[PDB]
Amino acid sequence: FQKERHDMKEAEKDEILLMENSRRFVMFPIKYHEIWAAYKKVEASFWTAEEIELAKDTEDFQKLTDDQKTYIGNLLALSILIENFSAQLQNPEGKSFYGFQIMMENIYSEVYSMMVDAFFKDPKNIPLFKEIANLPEVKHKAAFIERWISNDDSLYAERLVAFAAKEGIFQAGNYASMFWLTDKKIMPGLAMANRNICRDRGAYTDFSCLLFAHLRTKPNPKIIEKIITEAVEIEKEYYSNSLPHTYIEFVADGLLQGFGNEKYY
Amino acid sequence: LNKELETLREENRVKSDMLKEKLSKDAENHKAYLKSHQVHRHKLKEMEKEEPLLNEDKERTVLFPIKYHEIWQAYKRAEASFWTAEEIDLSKDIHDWNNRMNENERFFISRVLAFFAASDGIVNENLVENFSTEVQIPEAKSFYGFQIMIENIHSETYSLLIDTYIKDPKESEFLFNAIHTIPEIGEKAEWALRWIQDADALFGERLVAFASIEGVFFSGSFASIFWLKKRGMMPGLTFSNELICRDEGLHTDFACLLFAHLKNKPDPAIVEKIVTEAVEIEQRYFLDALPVALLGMNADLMNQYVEFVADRLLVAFGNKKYYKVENPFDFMEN
Ligand SMILES: [Zn+2]
């Protein structure tokens, strides 16, 4: 599928999505009902760090196993381009959704920090990985984004599928873990914060499945399965190399179906 | 008809043509100033590379321990003002628009709402591509993060509002076409090009330019709408207008806050020349384009209000008043 990629490159011009929308001063007679309803949906779920209580939630932290404390450490330490995608999507509907997404990301970056603070004390001294941020596993994550998204020789539809991998596939391990550690009464806080981020991250991933869906020229079905797999490999990696399952494959398939493909696992 | 509009426009044709003249020779006075201060501006653009705001802090990773409480608290203040268009009750508005407002009032509110829509995306770039991107400090990032998002809801409010008073597609068309042929538009464009888009421009100077855009360039519109809250009409509009004005006031205040953290600040002469030119373009709108008389307002008192808002801004930058006037509109006491 080399030659055909050349055609899609010339075809991306007929994509009304990537195309202009000029002359539309007033925006309410909505032209993109689908992405708009997607934006309204995340706009309604707007939440903040303040709406989260970690007090009397830190009790159940220091009671965890000596190493379970080390886990969460990196988990937070890790977590703690949307602009480019937003720049390519030419319409008020889409850019509104994107502006909201990066807006919410900063709140996640705050809530995460708060945990690092209320738990591992003010000093970031306890967080080990924080000093060696740029370590192997992440370099592999950075390479993936360097392959399908950053690489000049890439197509919009492709970058979309990769973006979703990076949004839904990747940190699936994280949430999968915390959903466990926050299963039944243990830490009500980290629980709500996790329930939310996972919900929004899901939506942010769907949004790319929604855009993709509206693309007139889809890329080859194999490249898709070729983009996901790689992220599933880069995921299993640190997900089972940082701290002490095959949940990724499950999600990896749902997303595969999300773009109109066959379940690889 | 357009007969009265000419009568009104004419009442301030001399005052207006002056501002026009004044503004005409700025594209020239500016190239001159730049031509003769090349050595000095070159040093400023350099030192810019030393400003805490404009450079990363690799030692900071915790991302929490509040280093800039002034800003963060600004952001939190904003973050607690979240609001949606869905909160705007317009049910009783369409009635007021057809039974209590004259043809001159509707002609004023319309164009005013249209001006708002004609600049709901142009400013999207400034905030990011020419601002958020810079300022390598998280507190400020959070703020701009939230500003851009709020601005998208303001852009919705204008379309929504316009989509409720001006349903007819044809009219909504003429509305903007007649709004694109206004001299002020180019004049604002020229001003920008002079203090924002023109390369070899200082961050500190853009800050004043941006703040002017947020707290001076529409101050008259916001004012002209609270004037309706007085006569007790368009609660759908005056509610949304109140919320947006608060929002813009906040964004301005934020500009001034960042400014205060700059080690090398723009010559007060330049800060005044930027705000002042803004004020002239703003006034011109209501002395040339839309006469406040159209809704029972006094031209002269409007100018004063704008000049007041600028002085209030000039002062929030460390400069000293320039018009020294007083707030003419008691209802804008807020
Ligand atoms: Zn603003």
Q: Which domain CATH number covers A106? A: 1.10.620.20
Could you tell me which residues of B are annotated as the binding site? 120, 151, 154, 214, 248, 251
- Residues in chain A after which the backbone breaks (C–N beyond 2.5 Å): 80, 244
The end-to-end CA distance of chain B, in Å, is 35
B157-173: b or e for each residue (b if 16 or more CB lie within 10 Å)?
Answer: bbbbbbbbbbeeeeebe
Cβ pair A96:B156 closer than 8 A: yes
Separation in Å, CA A128 to CA A29, B71, B72: 53, 30, 27
Output the CA–CA distances (angstroms, integers) from residue B123 to A53, A119, B116, B197, B219, in the order listed: 37, 41, 11, 12, 16
Q: How many CB pairs below 8 Å do chains A and B form together?
A: 65
Cβ <8 Å between B152 and A96: yes
Q: Hey, which residues of A are catalytic here?
A: 112
Residue pair A35/A94 in contact (Cβ under 8 Å)? The answer is: yes
Name the residue among B79, B152, B162 with its Cβ closest to that of A26: B162
- Three-state secondary structure of chain A: CCHHHHHHHHHCCCCCCCCCCCCCCCCCCCCCHHHHHHHHHHHHCCCCHHHCCCCCCCCCCCCCCCCHHHHHHHHHHHHCCHHHHHHHCCCHHHHHHHHHHHHHHHHHHHHHHHHHHHHCCCCCCCCCHHHHCCCHHHHHHHHHHHHCCCCCCCCHHHHHHHHHHHHHHCCHHHHHHHHHHCCCCCCHHHHHHHHHHHHHHHHHHHHHHHHHHCCCCCCCHHHHHHHHHHHHHHHHHHHCCCCCCCHHHHHHHHHHHHCCCCCCC
Cα separation, B70 vs B261, whole angstroms: 10
Chain A residue numbers with beta carbons less than 8 Å from the beta carbon of B148 are 99, 103
Tell me how many degrees the CA angle A155-A233-A6 measures, rounded to the nearest 5: 20
DSSP state at residue B53? G
Q: Which two tokens stand for residue B184?
A: 């002020």
CB B117 within 8 A of CB A26: yes
Resolution in A: 2.8
Report in angstroms the alpha-carbon separations of B11 from A69, B15, B52, B298: 75, 9, 51, 11
SS3 content of chain B, % helix, strand, coil (to 5): 75, 0, 25
Cα–Cα distance measured from residue A78 to residue B63, given in angstroms and rounded to the nearest whole number:
13
Residue A148 to residue B313: CA distance in whole angstroms = 47
Largest Cα separation within chain A, whole Å, is 62
Both tokens of residue B45?
């653009």
Experimental method: X-ray
How many degrees, rounded to 5, is the angle at CA A78 between CA A77 and CA A79? 100
The C-alpha atoms of residue A33 and residue A30 are separated, in whole angstroms, by: 6
Question: What residues of B are in the A interface, CB distance below 8 Å?
Answer: 61-65, 79, 82, 84, 114, 117-118, 121, 124, 128, 141-142, 145-146, 148-149, 152, 155-156, 159-160, 162-163, 169, 172, 176
Phi, psi of B240 (to 5 degrees): -60, -40
End-to-end Cα spacing for chain A: 23
| Contact between chains at B148 and A103 (C-beta distance less than 8 A) | yes
User: Which single residue is written with the structure tokens 């939190």?
Assistant: B76
Q: Count up the domains in chain A and report the number.
A: 1
- CA–centroid distance, B281 to ligand 1, in Å, is 19
CA distance B200 to B40: 12
Domain that holds residue A240: 1-265
A211 residue type, one letter: L
Q: Do residues A119 and A190 make contact, with C-beta atoms less than 8 angstroms apart?
A: no
Residues of chain B neighbouring A100 (CB-CB closer than 8 A): 149, 152
**Residues, CB-to-ion distance under 5 Å, ligand 1:** B 251
Tokens standing for B334?
């807020």
Do A170 and A33 contact (CB within 8 A), yes or no? no
Smallest CA–CA distance, residue A219 to chain B, in Å, is 31
Q: How far apart are CA B201 and CA A45, in angstroms?
A: 40
Domains annotated for chain B, with CATH where assigned, are 1-334 (1.10.620.20)
Q: Which of A43, A95, A130 sits opposite B84 (nearest CB)?
A: A43
- Closest chain B CA to residue A48: B79
In this structure, the number of other CB atoms found within 10 A of the CB of residue A40 comes to: 14
Identity of the residue in A26, A48, A100 whose CB atom sits nearest the CB atom of B159? A26
**Cβ atoms within 10 A of the Cβ of A190, count?**
25
Non-local (6+) Cβ contacts of B200 within 8 A are B34, B41, B45
